[PDB]
């Protein structure tokens, strides 16, 4: 019975809330009371990557921490050697409406998606040396908002049809599907062991998914509006989310509840991108106010501001070695920061 | 290592010349987002201009390139992907004029949300009321009764500058200009001069349509130029 199911669901939600309240014996602010503040984090722009025409909608760092792919809605994926700022590849896209890009962990491939609802995989190491669509993954019924490689043959994607999908690139078929979000999945992040991944959606909630089984292990609530970005804390047992309610929030997977919140009265614009530093002590969040804040992840105090973008900061990335940050923006420039 | 640096710089230059050519092509074409409901006659407009998660129609008027995007196979929750179209020259809007107990109210709310959205507040809109023949048929038959779906029709009088079409009944003119004035009441409120609207009374099979957008797009370009000189 639908009414019986609704009553049972309400009782289960109340039980979950009571369990979370019981587990919250201490606050993170009280726990981190003995940790000295990090002070002011004065980062400066070291490289400015020019060449994109339209607003840059995504970027992703390479595992070498030197090359990085950037997608602009002029119909271009540009691969930068961020050290020398020389472009390595300039891949024209079949559809100019790209909303996400990914760089393969081995560096052999890049991926992109967008309003065409199709994930295109580009091989950077072809026999001729040019870049051609190695694989065209079709089957999503909504725009592709994020995609992340697991390896050279499997890629996890998040679409505007409220579902995520794990694709086998060799055959082109969907290996796995993840359903349960009621709003569009706006970002996903793979765990360090890539056995789980968290997806934040336009339902003001994040969900932890088991890639092997396809089930949603946990659902994290607490944000008030659309979640635009999400990323694991480096240990793999916590993560952070940025939302349209203009507040960042760090949750943990083992207490199944919010750990702590990064918000300020002067900030009314939502967060479009989040990313941790290598140790996780700093949470870097890009905002609609063209700035990017650096939060003390344990004290919630804002330790820095990455001002310098002329338009909305649409994408962030911290290198695997933690040397540099890179922020793309709607003004069509990537800036590297130290 | 200097050999690798030279090879990388040669690759960068070969990329940069192609980027120069692609920038020349990109700046020489105008991107039009075509937005409208299913029965709004939008597909008929696309068919006229011509004769997947998005459909791209390239056409050329007076040796000028236009790129019009009919966004199909998407969900009705547009608040996220619509942000992609903040850099288009114009959002062509197709409204089912003679049309959910109140469809035109939903169209008005969609136009209002587009107008007040912070990323689309700089992008201009071309407005097409694509049900003029059907509007004439409905209002002449006496089945309109618009004064209960929109009570403002009980006191609205035709503005003095609103020239009716030749041979056109006063009721048809009053209804069509009432719809136009509702869209203008939305648009003129908090417009702030950063973006503009071009209400056009269109039929589904008008050949003038490809011209209208032209004469709108051109105007938009000019205004943007006049915005750069602080003249507007």
């Amino acid at each position, epitope marked *: 019975e639908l009414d019986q199911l609704r009553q049972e669901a309400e009782q289960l*939600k109340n039980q979950i809330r009571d369990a979370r309240k019981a587990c919250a014996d201490a606050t993170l602010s009280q726990i981190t009371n003995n940790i000295d503040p990090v002070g002011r984090i004065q980062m400066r722009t070291r490289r400015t990557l020019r060449g994109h025409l339209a607003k840059i909608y995504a970027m992703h760092w390479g595992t070498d921490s030197r090359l990085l792919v950037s997608a602009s809605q002029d119909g271009k994926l540009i691969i930068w050697d961020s050290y020398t700022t020389n472009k390595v590849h300039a891949i024209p896209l079949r559809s100019s409406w790209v909303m996400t890009c990914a760089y393969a962990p081995s560096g052999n491939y890049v991926a992109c998606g967008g309003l065409d609802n199709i994930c295109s995989i580009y091989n950077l190491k072809t026999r001729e040396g040019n870049v051609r669509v190695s694989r065209e993954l079709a089957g999503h019924t909504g725009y592709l908002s994020c995609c992340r490689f697991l390896d050279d043959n499997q890629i996890v994607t998040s679409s505007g049809d409220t579902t995520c999908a794990l694709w086998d690139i060799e055959t082109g078929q969907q290996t796995t599907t993840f359903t349960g979000h009621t709003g569009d999945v706006m970002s996903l992040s793979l765990a360090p062991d890539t056995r789980l991944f968290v997806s934040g959606a*336009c*339902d003001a909630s994040a969900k932890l998914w088991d890639v092997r089984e396809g089930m949603c292990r946990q659902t994290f609530t607490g944000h008030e509006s659309d979640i635009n970005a999400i990323c694991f804390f480096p240990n793999g047992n916590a993560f952070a989310t940025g939302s*349209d309610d203009a507040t960042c929030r760090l949750f943990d997977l083992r207490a199944d509840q919010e750990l702590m919140t990064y918000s300020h009265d002067n900030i009314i614009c939502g967060i479009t991108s989040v990313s941790f530093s290598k140790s996780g002590r700093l949470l870097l969040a890009g905002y609609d106010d063209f700035n990017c804040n650096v939060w003390d992840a344990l004290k919630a105090d804002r330790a820095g501001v990455l001002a310098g973008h002329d338009n909305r900061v649409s994408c962030l990335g911290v290198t695997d070695d933690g040397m540099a940050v890179a922020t793309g923006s709607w003004d069509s420039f990537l800036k590297i920061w130290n | 290592q200097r050999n690798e640096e030279k090879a990388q710089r040669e690759a960068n230059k070969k990329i940069e010349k192609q980027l120069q050519k692609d920038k020349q092509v990109y700046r020489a074409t105008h991107r039009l987002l075509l937005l409208g409901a299913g029965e709004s006659g939008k597909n008929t407009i696309v068919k006229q201009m011509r004769i997947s998660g998005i459909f791209e129609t390239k056409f050329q008027v007076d040796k000028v390139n236009f790129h019009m995007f009919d966004v199909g196979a998407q969900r009705d*929750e547009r608040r996220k992907w619509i942000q992609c179209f903040n850099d288009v020259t114009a959002i062509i809007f197709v409204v089912a004029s003679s049309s959910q*107990t109140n469809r035109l*109210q939903a169209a008005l709310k969609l136009f209002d949300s587009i107008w*007040n959205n912070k990323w689309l507040r700089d992008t201009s809109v071309i407005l097409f009321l694509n049900k003029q023949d059907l509007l004439a048929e409905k209002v002449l038959a006496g089945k309109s009764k618009i004064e209960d*779906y929109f*009570p403002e029709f009980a006191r609205y009088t035709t503005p003095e500058d609103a020239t009716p079409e030749p041979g056109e009944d006063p009721r048809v003119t009053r209804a069509k200009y009432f719809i136009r004035d509702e869209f203008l009441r939305i648009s003129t409120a908090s417009g702030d001069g950063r973006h503009y609207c071009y209400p056009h009374f269109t039929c589904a099979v008008d050949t003038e349509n490809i011209r209208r957008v032209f004469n709108d797009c051109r105007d938009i370009i000019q205004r943007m130029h006049l915005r750069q000189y602080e003249l507007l």
Partner: nanobody, 126 residues
Framework: QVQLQESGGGLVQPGGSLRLSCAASGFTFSNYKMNWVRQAPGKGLEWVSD????????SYTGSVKGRFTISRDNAKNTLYLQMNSLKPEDTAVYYC?????????????????????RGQGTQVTV
């Protein structure tokens, strides 16, 4: 979790008055705009009314002007629709909807079939 629980909908004689109430939880009520939408039997979602953050700016759909009145109570985090001069065509499921972002003027998607921040709704039969 964003929760919008409505109450007060029920059978009423034509020409009657009925007070739909909406209790909101899981978000800051004063920061977001609010909207009442309705779904008639066999019809799609229809926008009825909205009220801004401060409560000063009020709008209604044409078919309900002068009859229904929206209000918000920020100290109690609730939304009201006072219906008067009810008609048989007013029979519908009424959903208390929310704008997708705070301090923001655009209220996009409040009438979507699978909208997220929308209440379960209460049925009003006239």
């Amino acid at each position: 979790q964003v929760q919008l629980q409505e109450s007060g909908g029920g059978l009423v004689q034509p020409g009657g008055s009925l007070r739909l109430s909406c209790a909101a939880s899981g978000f800051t009520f004063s920061n977001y705009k609010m909207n009442w939408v309705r779904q008639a039997p066999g019809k799609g979602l229809e926008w009825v009314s909205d009220i801004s953050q401060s409560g000063a700016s009020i709008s209604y759909t044409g078919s309900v002007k002068g009859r229904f009145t929206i209000s918000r109570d920020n100290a109690k985090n609730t939304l009201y629709l006072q219906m008067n001069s009810l008609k048989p065509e007013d029979t519908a499921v009424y959903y208390c909807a929310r704008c997708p972002a705070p301090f923001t003027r655009d209220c996009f998607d409040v009438t979507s079939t699978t909208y997220a921040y929308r209440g379960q709704g209460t049925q009003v039969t006239v």
